[PDB]
Each structure stands twice: as C-alpha cells, then as structure tokens.
Design a protein around this ligand. Structure first.
Ligand SMILES: Nc1ccn([C@@H]2O[C@H](COP(=O)(O)OP(=O)(O)OP(=O)(O)O)[C@@H](O)[C@H]2O)c(=O)n1
Ligand SMILES: Nc1ccn([C@@H]2O[C@H](COP(=O)(O)OP(=O)(O)OP(=O)(O)O)[C@@H](O)[C@H]2O)c(=O)n1
Ligand SMILES: NC(=O)CC[C@H](N)C(=O)O
Ligand SMILES: NC(=O)CC[C@H](N)C(=O)O
Ligand SMILES: NC(=O)CC[C@H](N)C(=O)O
Ligand SMILES: [Mg+2]
Ligand SMILES: [Mg+2]
Ligand SMILES: [Mg+2]
Lengths: 535, 532, 535
C-alpha cells in the first residue's frame, strides 16, 4: 500500500485552528479503519520548544520517547490513538541545525549549500521519516501562507507533490471567512486572495476549509469554488462550535473524508463516529457541577495549561460532572491572601519554573490540606506540596527547593547531586519522557490506576530530596510511588484528607476524551463529593 | 492654493465603510475651514447607475444637476456642505464609453489605444475635473485592492501621485483587523498582506485606517506600522460605532487631520466639531419614541431607501424623537391585508418602479388617509395617494397610472404625452427644480417660504385633465412647477398630517440642517402616538 | 557625520554584475574624498565559503585578517583602497548559526525565536557592524529579488531604512533589459515586473541600474521611470563594456554619484577619475603582446582563478603588455603530454586541492624549468614545483606531498606534524590571512619587492618539509623567503633560469589595477623578454 499525504496549510490569519482541524480529520479517517498519522512543522528557529516559556506558544508537550514538542501533538494524541514521537514535530531551527552541522563537517563535498535544494531536501526527508508506514499522513504546516517564515516548508511540500504525484497528495488549506455587520454577510474575498498567494508559491489547493463564526452558506461556498479552481464539494464549512468533539462529525457530514478516500483511491468503510458521539453525549448531559481552581503563574495565557484543562474536561466526562475551571493567579495569593480561594470544590496546582508566584502555591497547597478541600498537584504543584508539608507539619522552618533559594537549611526538593542534610552532610539531566513508576501497596493511586506499575511522562529536573525524606514521612506524609531504580519519589499523598494526591510526572499528557484518566477521574469525583457535602 | 489629493482605498474585504470614512474625514477638514470635496470612482461597467435596480447597489442618488450617481454621494452631501455634481462620480463604464467614442471617431489619429496610457489618461482627466478649485480632494476608489476591476483606477492615481508630487498627495488605505475568539486578539496579518498587494501595484500607503468591531490597541497599531512602512501616528483605529456622527470626532481625536494638514503644509485652525457634537447629543437623548412604517417594494435591501431612512433619523434629531423604522413589504398588504399596518404612528410610502406591490401601496395610502394616521408619500408614494383618492373619494373606478395599466379608464398619472380623459379626449425629469407653494398649505408653512428647490427622478406626472375633478372631490394642490404647472405636492386637508410629493425630499435632508417635511412628518407622528 | 547606506539588490537574473557595479560606484565616491566601504550578504547556508569548491562560486578570497570570503570582496579591494575584513561578508548560514548557538544556550529567555524579529535583528546588527565609521556603506545583497533565499535580507534592510530614515538610505536595484532581435528594441518589461516584486517585499527602489548588451536609450529609460515611480535621472544605463575600468566613468557621466550625494546631503568635490583614466589609457595602449598559459585543474570555471587573472592583467598594465591568458587543463598534460604547452611565453600554475590533475602540474613545472620558459607558481603551483625539482634534480624518486600519497618515501610537502625523513625519522591548522615574510638577501624577489620584509596572504595547510629541505638546496634550489618564526619556506627560486619563482602565499589577493604587484609585473616583463628572444 502506497503512503498518501494530505498537506494542511492556513491562510489569512493564524489561530485558525489548523491543529484541531487536522486532528479531527485524522479522527474521521481512523474510524474508517485507515492507519493515520499527523506531524507538525513549526517555522520557529528554536531547535525544539524546550527553551520556550509556557506563555510563548503554550505548554511544552512531551511524547513517550521524551521529545519536547508543540502542543499541537497533544491535540493529535487526543483525536487519534497513534503515539507521537520526535518524528512528528520539527522546526526550522532543527532543519537548519542539521544542515549546518553537515556542512561544517564537509558532508556536502564542497557544494554551495542552498535553500533549494539543501534546506528543502532536509525537510522532505523528515516529512518522509514521519510518514513511514502509515496509509495517510497529515502534514500540518505552521505559520500563514504569504509570510516569509514558512516558504521553505511550502516549497518542500510542493516538490514532494510533484515527485509523489497527485494520486497520493492533497493540499488542504484553511482560510478565514469573516462576517461583516454593516452588510450582514460573510466574506469570500480573503479566501480568494489567500488562494492566489498559495498559487503564487506554486500550490493549487485541492480542499478549502472555511473558518467562520457561523456556517458558510452555499452561495459563498460556490463563489469560493468559482474563484479558487476547486469543485464546490471540496469547499468545506467549519464554523466556531461549542465543542471540539463535534468537529469530526461536522466534517464527515460534508463529505470531506469521502472526497479524500476517492482522491487517494481507498475503499474503506464509512467512518463509524460512535466514540465521538458518545463523548459528545456525555458532555451534553452532566448530572452535576463543580468548580475547580487552577492555581499557577501562567494563567494569563491558558494554553500554558492546555493538556491539564483538557484532562479536567475528560474527568468531567467520566463522572458526568460539568467542570467550571477557574484560573487563579498564584501570585495574587501572596498579595490578597487565601481569601481568593473561597468557593472552590477542588484545587489543582500545575507545573512551572522560576520562583515568582511559588510562595502563593505553597500557601495554596496549605489551605487545601487544612480545610480538607481536594487537591491535585502536578510536578511543581507536587513540589510546593512537599514544601508545604515540611514547613507546616514536619516543622522544618523555611524549607524549600534549591531551584528557588539554593542555600536554604532544608532543601526538600533539589537536584539529585545537590542533595544535602540540614547539617550539610551528603551521601557517597532533565527527566524526559515515559517512565515506569511503582505504586505503593496501600495508596489512593494504587487503587485508582488499579495496577502495581504505571507508565507516565516526565519533564522536570528537581527531585524529592531523599536525605530529608524520612523526616517528612515520620510527620504523616506518605510516599505513593517511586521510579524503577534509585527509588526517587513520583507520588505523595496526605492521608488525613478526603483526596490529596501530587505527582512529578505530567499525567495530563496521557489523558484523552475517549479513555479518560484514572487520576483526573478520581480528582473530579472527589470534587463532586466535596461539593455535595457543602450543600 | 495648490490642489491636494487624498486617495482612499480599501483592502481585505468590501463593505468596509470607505464612503463614510471618507465623508467623515472630509467633515473634519471642512470644519478646519478648508475648501473640500469628495468623488467616487466605481469599477462597474454601467455607464451610470440610472439602469441599476435599487436592490443592486442601493438607491440611485440624484444630484442638483440631475446626475444619477452612487449612493455614496448621499453620504458625502450629508457630511460636507459642498454640492456634488456629475463630476463627483464616474464608472469604468463611463471611462471606456468616452474612449471608445473618441476612437471610432478618429481622435486618436490612428494610434493603438491602450489601457495605458489612454484609459488611465481618461481617468486622470476626470479626477482633475472633479478636483478643480478645491483645497483638498478625497478621491474614493471603489472595489478592493487585489482585484482586477479597479486596477486601472489604481494605476491612474499612482501616476497622478508621481506627476503632482508627494507634497500634494496622500494615500489612505482602509483594512480589516478581525477579532479571533480562539486567541482573544485582533489580527494584523490581513493588513500586512493587503499593504503588500497595494505596494505591488506601485502604491505605498501613507495612512492606514484599521476597521474592526472594537478598538485596535497600540500594540497592533505598532506592528502594522513596523510592517507597512508607515509611522505609528498614521495608523488609525476606526471601530464599529453606534453612530456615524461620532466618526469625525473619533478620527480627530487620533490626529488624522493634523497629520494630513502637516503633510499638505496647511495652517488651518483646529476643527470645530460643535455641530456634530450637537447632533450626537440629540441622537443620544431622545425624549419620546415612535414606530414609523416604511411600505414599499424593495425592503429586502434597505439601502434601496438609504436617504429616506436617514432623513427620518434627521427628523428624529430635530424633535428629539427616536424613530423606529419598521420596513414593510407592500406586497404583504396585498396577501395578508391592512392588519400588518397595526401599530404605527405614521406611514411613509417611498418611490419605486414596476407594478408589483403597488396595489399594496394604494391600500396602504387609504388606510392612512382613512384612520387619520400621518402619511408621507414620496414620488410613487405621492402618485399612489392620488390613485387612492380619485379611486375612493372622487369615485373614479379602477383609476391608475399608465405606467401600470396603460389603457385604464382613468389615467390620473400618465406621461405628459399620454394625457387624456375618461372619454379618450386630449389637450423623464431629473435634478434640482423650482417648485411653487400654494399660499394656504401645510407645506408653505413647514418650508416657511413661497418658492423652493427639490430634486426629481421620475417620468409620470399627475394628469391635469383629470385634475379639476379630483380637486372638487376634496384633495388639495399644495405645490406646482414653473411652466405646464405640473403638480408637485398634494395634501388631504381633513387629516392631521397628510403630505405627498413628486420630488425626493430625502436628497436634501442632512443631520446638521434637518428637513422641514421630515421634521413636520416626525413631529406629527409623535403627536399621534401621544393621543393613543 | 551620520552613516549613509546604499543597498544594492538585483532582479530578473543573477550574473548581473552587482559586485562590479557596486564596486565601481564605490570607486567614484572614493574619488570625491568620501570614506566608503562595501559588504556582501550571501544567501548560502555555508557558514563561510571555506567549504566551497572553487568551481562552485569561484575562488575563495582571503582578507588580511584571515577570513575566507566571497570573491566579490576581491572586486571591492580592486576598486577602493579600503581593506576588507570578516566584517564585510556574511552568509545566511553564519546568521542562523549565531542565532542557534544563542537560542540553545538560553539567551533569548524563553522567547519564541523567529525569522522576524530574531533573524532579521541579527542581520541588521552585522550590517551596522560593517558600516561602523564610514560615511557611505554599500550593502550588496546576494541572490535575486523574488526568490526565497534572500527574503530575510530584504526584510532586514527594509526595516533599517525605516529606522534610519530616507535621509540616509537609498535602494539601488539592478535589472536586465534584454534586446529582442525580431523587434530590434531593448525591453523594459522585466524591469517593470522586477520593481513590482521588489515593491511587494516593501522596498521602493530609488535608483535603477539597467543592464543590457548596449546602451538603454532615453525612450526606454523614461518608460522605466514612468512605471517604477523613479525620476528619469535615477534610471541609469549600464551596458556591457570591454573594460571594467570604464565603469566608474560611465556611471559618473550619468550623474549617479551626484544623485547620491544630493540625497545623502554631502558637499563633496567632483569625482576625480584620473587614476581610472590612467589605467584605461595603459590598457588601451599596449606596446607588445605575450601569451601566458595558466595550467590547473579548475579551468572549466575561470572564476576559480578570478584574482589571478586580474593580477596578470595588472602585470600587463605595468609593462604595457597585452596578456593573452590561455587556460590549460593540467589533466590534459597527463593525457596528451607536454605537447599542449607549445607556444607559450610564460607559465603560471595556480592553487588547488586534491590529487586529480596534480601530476600534470608537476610535469608542467618541469617543462618550464627545462626549456627555460618563465614560471610563476602559486601555493599548489609552488608545491608541485618543489616536487618537480626533488624528483628530477635532487633525484628523490617518486617524491610527493602527503596530501596526495600519504605514505610516500620522500614527502617533500606535508603537514608540519606529519614531517618525516626518507628513513622514517622525525624531529623532537590552516594558515590563513596576512602574514609577514622575510626575503632572502640575494633573490629575485628581494629585488622585485624591494624590501627585506613583505606582507602577503595565506590559505594552505601543507608546508615545505624542512627535514627533506637541505637535500634539495644542495641540488641547486634556493629558498627566497621564510616566515617570521619556525622558518617555514614561503618562496623558492630555480636560479639557473631566466625567471622561475614560486610562493605559498596568494600574491594575487594584493594585486590591483592602480598599484599593480611587484611579482606579477616581474613575471610579465620576463614573459615579454622571453617572447622577444624567440622572434
Ligand atoms: N479577481 C476578482 C474577483 C472579483 N472581482 C470583482 O469583485 C466585485 C465584487 O466585489 P466583492 O463583493 O467585494 O467581491 P466578492 O467576490 O463578492 O467577495 P465577498 O464574498 O468578499 O464579497 C465584482 O464586481 C467583480 O468584478 C475582481 O475585480 N477581481
Ligand atoms: N512578512 C512576515 C511577517 C511575519 N512573519 C512571521 O510571522 C510570525 C508571527 O505570526 P502571526 O502572529 O500569525 O503574525 P503577526 O505578524 O503577529 O500578525 P497578527 O496580528 O495577525 O498575529 C513571526 O514568527 C514572523 O517570523 C513572516 O514570516 N513574514
Ligand atoms: N514543569 C514543571 O512543573 C517543572 C518543575 C520544576 N521547576 C523542575 O524543573 O523540576
Ligand atoms: N422614483 C420613483 O418613485 C418613480 C415614480 C414613477 N415610476 C415615475 O417614473 O414617475
Ligand atoms: N589553494 C591551494 O593551492 C592549497 C594548496 C594545498 N592543497 C594546501 O592545502 O596546502
Ligand atoms: Mg460580494
Ligand atoms: Mg501575532
Ligand atoms: Mg513596448
């Protein structure tokens, strides 16, 4: 079976929903039994998003194999059951960095190294490596048709299409169709002009996905076809919907996947969207409501927490509980006190870097342990909770993480090789990716995950200081999971509490709307339980 | 006194507000004491909008000199006091038409006649004609930058800018900066792309006017400036507003007029927007409310009645009355009956052509003459009033206009050449025309003068031979022309407020100066509303 | 005094003569007493041309400070008396390589690193560093307006222009105006369309330089002005000329520099072109003719030898001798024998890498030493001559350079740390840039350069093997110059010959048409002397 490529580009503006549109299309194809994958090409110069603040392009997502990648890969894994790896995300930086290393070491045998063919060859090679043995590969191109930064990407895929042939390649282009109040109509002009820009780069789109805040009527769809050399049936409307889970069914109901299977000549059964319809049904029919406070330092751009917010939403689905997520600046806790935590059925403290806003989290971890409000702490949020417990229950004054005050008396969280005592004695490298974790026989989480061993994903360097550990266990705190070797602590529980769990790994990256996640489902159940005993 | 041009263009999408934007800008400049004018270049092929359906590009506006032009000229006249004439509007059709004629007749001396320089030359000459003897001329280019249709307009102005010089020309380019809900941001990408299209046609914009449904924040303005080679102070924000009357003010508060005066080297006092401030204040503080029904055949596209809608709103201002205009399909008076006129404090029947829906208008004029509801009838509306009368009070069975049923026994409205009687016995107006007011009419009063000037666009007149008969049965002749004493205004004098006229009074109404008929009409509608 | 920038771009095609057009313009400005410089921006990905074969974009030029750069810098140094350094040439590779190194080490503080502003900032910074304290800086942009590879360059300079203002920036754009035989006219259409491409990138050219194979008449110049928003007087004609030395006077005679000085507001005296007129006069009035054979492995692209060919031409000027340069494949010597060297008044063997064609050079060095035909050997050509002498006069059979047969018995040329005996005994890193060299008291070259110490430029790694040196001196060969320390051999002479010199340094990079070069002038004199005793 020959591999087919659908290239996804966007025009007019960015924030158009390319990731989500691609992922949804992939979900449909998946449900026709096709073997599908997706990859993201980002135009940034960063070698990988590992050096990007979460308020730049949102969360740094992590795949099983430890790659730091764009958050689109989160969308991909939540719409299809394929696992993303390093192979599904690369940037312009990564391309240039490979080519420079090869040029400097003489691999090009004295040739002038050029954007074409050398940069573009490099791009084609990773596109082929990401597609390897899949029937259909959606290749999402970042940036907007017309700007400078994504031109080599577009020229690469142009070349591929000619090389591979139109029998096995399609171009899917998203554009904006804005509504004008004065005239009461949506406008095709930007689509017309975007398609001319795309053509001027040498690409004829085959399918047009029309983004608007309402459906694009037949009249205007026909106008777009007329001007873009695309048949009417390949001009698809994609309105703003109240739930992303509806997107696959919306695209299916307009023939998009039929049109694709015909072009690629695949006999495949009609997409069965039962799992989506189920998720949609669940979402539409909550039995009760909770309010969960997410308390962290990046709430000014919520995408910093994209996968967490979705995991919560999946926790809602598994409990038929509608989760109202209220974002709370953890630094306002420092200023305005515990006051602003009033009125919450649970509390989540997410991950982060840098001292700013961390003392507000420690406080937040406290308030939730003392008032018996259920608490989930992820990475940093597990670290600030160890810190809370030590300071306030094992009475280790001023305890902290070497990340924030390097020279503190009780460094409860520190790099493995910074580990020391309160006396100064010692014993005689980012953790990335999927790692096995042993669950402790009598813990909440051993029951929730219901297995002695689980696999979750890491992105952190600061560990639980084993040298100060016994002193904290002795004061009540329980260790609920450890790694495979060198027993580092992965999970802690405060057992005098309805529901208080915190973990080092990012469980949100393995949560999905179809299959949920045992930790979040638990966390949300507890929030509902707690909500109902206050009423 | 060198003449300065400001070329106004539009990018991304149309329906951007170029007309109003340009008109507002003009309003500010006039308020600084400058001699100013505006003109519209339409890319369409119609020689003029005279053959255009009112549901196509809206109403056909008529200027003092009797030209039929785009409705944008209405906006112009409602923002500045300079009078538009036929030189303030021309189409691509008009341009090719003149060049073709000159060519078939040999004026090109056997040259190959080309888009450049012959079509572009013809465009340049007309832009110069519309501009002559003005300080600042706003030239509004129809269509959207990027499209085929307006390229010759764009190349002609590019040439003009280079000929006349950068010290006397400015390019103002409007764009759309849409809001994305996903990100909570307005987006400058389309502006950056549109300025590129404009540059590729050889035009560097000087001023960017950013349309959006909310203000464009300083960050986005700064990014537009960085990418488009314009300084930040020349990136202006023009959000959707709740009242066009606030647009002169909104632009002036961002320094637009200063920027222009600086570039064109003019010392002019600061703009005095007091009349606009007054207009905004009136509109913001109505004391009563009314519902007025507009009954006619083009309600599917409200711009068909653009100047009438506005003249009512100006009637509102002058009485501090807020007017709700209920657009009513007069075809529905035919199907569903007089019920659909339930709940109106006044009824206006506007102009039109074609029989479809006119029987509904006659039922409508009756309803109002009968149930003592105030009525204003413009052109068709005045004609269908006479039909109602003769037909229901002078008992002239099935009376009509020859435009609709040519061989009717009683042609009360008919071309002047068609003028007959009930036995068969015997014996198109455009522009500003003098009208004489009858000494004892509700209208000699409202206009507070003997003779007036109003604008015509119609063929069919009141039949003078059937006239003395309808006068006897009650009806009153309130105004008449110069010669042939044709009937211009009729009143039913046993009604609180019933006026109807042949001319289009809406074309002279402005928000600053109001209009005596619509002031009158709206005042009456208020008085009626109080009595229920 | 404020720095002014003239940006030079090209359109329609490449090979348009941007380097030469810029350099000539610089020469005019120089002659108005202005302090001028020039820089080249290349769109290649190579970090620097050090890894490019000479048949890629021609010779790798070397500046005093040792930078490996584009051959345009040769043109610059031959038209103005400023010295080029690393500062005057950078590539896209160099830009990306700096930015990647800074991004990976966290210098961007978590920002997304983008083509704009990060790549473009980097470019602006080197443009400012190259311009530092000069009155006028010509900034030559490589590639052709309209292609992908030079877009960031164009966007950078666009930004600069707005920032610095039009008071101190001009855009000079070259285009092609082709002659059509069918119609008998030159065509302005490509200029029209190129200027629209340049505008679409956001740059309004200020000056148009019209390349054609004949002058561009007034009619068409006016047409170009009409369509490009440029005044007639800024549309300059630049026909194919028989001598580049005429280009400054051609541009001057059309007001180009007047137009520039007016725009930048400089009072400067009229350009005095006396030195050029002199060079032109010299060139036009040769007294006799010679034929010099250039024998090397890259003659398929003569630009591989750009500066050598020009040095010869300057040697012609200093002797009023018209040099007919005949290029000869040194590999055809291997095949067709010494035969193809018949009919030559001198012989030059240039530099190179790799064994292919080197045995033909050794042979060539031989033929010239035996028949007393004057010989100049540069770098490789000095190495193959040591090799010739050893094999055939010091009778060291099969002698060679470790570069070619690493394990040979007599490695006469080898890396310093490969140095060994014919017995295998030993004693108890490219050379780049301007280095001092001591001249030997009784040598030809000590007289020609007329000083005990000279400065010439290196680009080589293989040295004269000091361990086998005494054995070659003993057989006749004389050392004519050495370095400063560690006495490595820079120059050799065979003293039983009318004129036989060879050197390690590249003397062609310090030769110019105005001031000539003592070695080449000598070499050409000798060729003329030799030509005249055969007649
Ligand atoms: N490449 C094109 C496409 C359309 N037009 C012109 O576009 C005008 C219509 O303008 P507008 O409504 O702004 O364009 P639409 O195509 O209707 O797009 P939208 O849906 O945005 O209105 C027509 O007169 C037609 O001649 C043009 O000149 N060149
Ligand atoms: N001519 C341009 C302009 C911008 N960019 C790229 O555009 C990206 C920003 O994308 P986006 O936010 O979509 O564009 P903005 O310029 O911010 O515009 P908007 O207001 O629509 O976001 C940057 O990485 C920059 O490299 C580009 O490649 N070419
Ligand atoms: N993403 C996170 O929460 C990281 C936590 C902490 N700063 C660490 O590096 O270990
Ligand atoms: N504009 C109109 O109302 C036209 C009225 C009528 N059809 C006429 O021609 O006289
Ligand atoms: N440019 C050259 O001639 C180099 C000569 C020789 N291959 C060396 O590296 O020393
Ligand atoms: Mg339209
Ligand atoms: Mg942006
Ligand atoms: Mg021609």
């Amino acid at each position: 079976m020959t591999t087919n490529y659908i290239f996804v580009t966007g025009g007019v503006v960015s924030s158009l929903g390319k990731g989500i549109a691609a992922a949804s299309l992939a979900a449909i194809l998946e449900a026709r039994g096709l073997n599908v994958t997706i990859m993201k090409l980002d135009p940034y110069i960063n070698v990988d998003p590992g050096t990007m603040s979460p308020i730049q392009h949102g969360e740094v997502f992590v795949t099983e194999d430890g790659a730091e990648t764009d958050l689109d890969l989160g969308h991909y894994e939540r719409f299809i059951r394929t696992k993303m790896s390093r192979r599904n995300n690369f940037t312009t930086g990564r391309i240039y960095s490979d080519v420079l290393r090869k040029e400097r070491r003489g691999d090009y045998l004295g040739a002038t190294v050029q954007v074409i063919p050398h940069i573009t060859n490099a791009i084609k090679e990773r596109v082929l490596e990401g597609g390897e043995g899949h029937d259909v590969v959606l290749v999402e191109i970042g940036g907007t048709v017309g700007d400078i930064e994504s031109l080599p990407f577009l020229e690469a895929i142009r070349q591929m299409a000619v090389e591979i042939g139109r029998e096995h390649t399609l171009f899917m282009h998203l554009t904006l169709v804005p509504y004008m109040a004065a005239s009461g109509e949506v406008k095709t002009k930007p689509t017309q002009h975007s398609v001319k820009e795309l053509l001027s780069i040498g690409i004829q789109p085959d399918i047009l996905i029309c983004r608007s805040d309402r459906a694009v009527p037949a009249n205007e769809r026909a106008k777009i076809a007329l001007f873009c050399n695309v048949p009417e049936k390949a001009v698809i409307s994609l309105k703003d919907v109240d739930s992303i889970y509806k997107i696959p069914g919306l695209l299916k109901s307009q023939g998009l996947d039929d049109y694709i299977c015909k072009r690629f000549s695949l006999n495949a059964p009609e997409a069965n969207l039962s799992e989506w319809e189920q998720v949609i049904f669940e979402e539409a029919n909550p039995v009760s409501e909770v309010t969960i406070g997410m308390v962290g330092k990046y709430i000014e751009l919520p995408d910093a927490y994209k996968s967490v917010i979705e995991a919560l939403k999946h926790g809602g689905l598994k409990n038929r509980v509608s989760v109202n997520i209220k974002l709370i600046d953890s630094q306002d806790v420092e200023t305005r006190g515990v006051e602003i935590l009033k009125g919450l059925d649970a509390i989540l403290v997410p991950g982060g870097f840098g001292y700013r806003g961390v003392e507000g989290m420690i406080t937040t971890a406290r308030f939730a342990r003392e008032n018996n409000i259920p608490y989930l702490g992820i990475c940093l949020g597990m670290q600030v909770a160890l810190i809370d417990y030590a300071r306030h229950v094992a009475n280790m004054e001023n305890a902290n993480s070497t990340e924030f005050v390097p020279d503190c008396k009780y460094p409860v969280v520190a790099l493995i090789t910074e580990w020391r005592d309160e006396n100064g004695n010692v014993e005689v490298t980012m953790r990335l990716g999927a790692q096995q974790c042993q669950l402790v026989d009598d813990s909440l989480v051993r029951q929730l995950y219901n297995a002695p061993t689980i696999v979750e994903r890491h992105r952190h360097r600061y560990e639980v200081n084993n040298m100060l550990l016994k002193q904290i266990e002795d004061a009540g705190l329980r260790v609920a999971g450890r790694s495979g070797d060198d027993q580092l602590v992965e999970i802690i529980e405060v057992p005098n509490h309805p529901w208080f769990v915190a973990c080092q790994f990012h469980p949100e990256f393995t949560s999905t709307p179809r299959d949920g996640h045992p930790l979040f489902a638990g966390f949300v159940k507890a929030a509902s339980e707690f909500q109902k005993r206050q009423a």
